[PDB]
Symmetry: none
Subunit: 55 residues, 10 copies
């Protein structure tokens, strides 16, 4: 076989899960957050996949 | 087989899940948030997939 | 076989999970956060995959 | 076979898990955080994969 | 076979797990944090994979 | 002060929450269930407060 | 002060939370269940407070 | 002071939390369950407070 | 002071938490379960407080 | 002071935590279970407080 990509690719066979991202956010997984009190200014309480590039 | 992509591709066979994103947000997964009190200015309480690029 | 990529690629066969990211955040895994009180200004309480590049 | 990459690639066969990242965050693994009280200003309480490059 | 990379590559066969990172954070492994009280300003309580390059 | 009860009482002062039960069920708390597929005959999928006394 | 109870009592002062139960179930706390597939006959998947006295 | 109980009592002062139970189940605490697949016949997957007295 | 109990009592002053149980189950504490696959017939996967008296 | 109990009592002053149990299960403590695969028939995977008296 032959393949040429510029990116971003994701090429496969017999594949149970696939995610391609440029951005941006993708949530595909099981996630449970239980929480009782959030205070403070300002605290990232429960972050799973996170990116902060403030300018 | 032969394939040429510019991106972003996601090419496969026999594949249970697929996500392609440029952006942007995609939520495809099970997610449960239970929460009782959020305060503060300003706190990211429960973030799963998150991207902040303020300018 | 033959392959030429510019990146970012992810090329495979017989592959159960795949993630390609440029960004950005991708959450595909099982995650449970149980939490009772968050205070302080400002404290990253429970971070799993995290990136902070403030300017 | 033949392959030429610019990076970042991840090329394989018969492969159970794959992650490619430039960024950014990717969470694909099982993670359990149980927590009772977070205080202080500001303390990284429970960080699993973490990167802080404040300028 | 023949291969030329610029990096960062990860090239393999018959491979159970793969991670490629430039960044950034990747969490793919089992992780359990149980915690009862975090105080102090500011103390990295429980860090698994961590990088701090404040300027 | 003086108090005589037969039960079930719940006597207090300055008290944020109170529940008295004989029965029976009382749900006063925050609860989030997210769920994707339930099968089997017959499986208690997600039970929070539960009592089964079949005769 | 003086108090005589038969039970079940719960007597207090300056008290943030109170539960009295004879039964029966009481749910007053924060609870998050995220779930993707339940099978089998019959499996208690996620039980928090649970009592089974089948006869 | 003077007190005579038959049980079950719970007598106090200046008390943040109180639970009295005869039964039965009481859930007052923070709880997060994240789960991806439950199979088998029949397996208690994730039990927190549990009592099984089948006859 | 004077006290006579038959049991089960729990008598106190200046007390942050109290639990009285006859039964039965009481869950008042922070609990996080993250889980990816449960199989087998039948395996107690993750049990925190547990009692099995099958007859 | 004077006290006569039949049991089970728990009598105190200035006391941060209290548990009285006859049964039965009580979970009041911080607990984190992260888990990736459970198999076998039948294996107690992760048990914290456990009692099995099958007849």
């Amino acid at each position: 076989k032959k393949g040429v990509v510029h990116g971003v690719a994701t090429v496969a066979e017999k594949t149970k899960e696939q995610v391609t991202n440029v951005g941006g956010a993708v949530v595909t997984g099981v996630t449970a957050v239980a929480q009782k009190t959030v205070e403070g200014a300002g605290s990232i309480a429960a972050a799973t996949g996170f990116v902060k590039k403030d300018q």
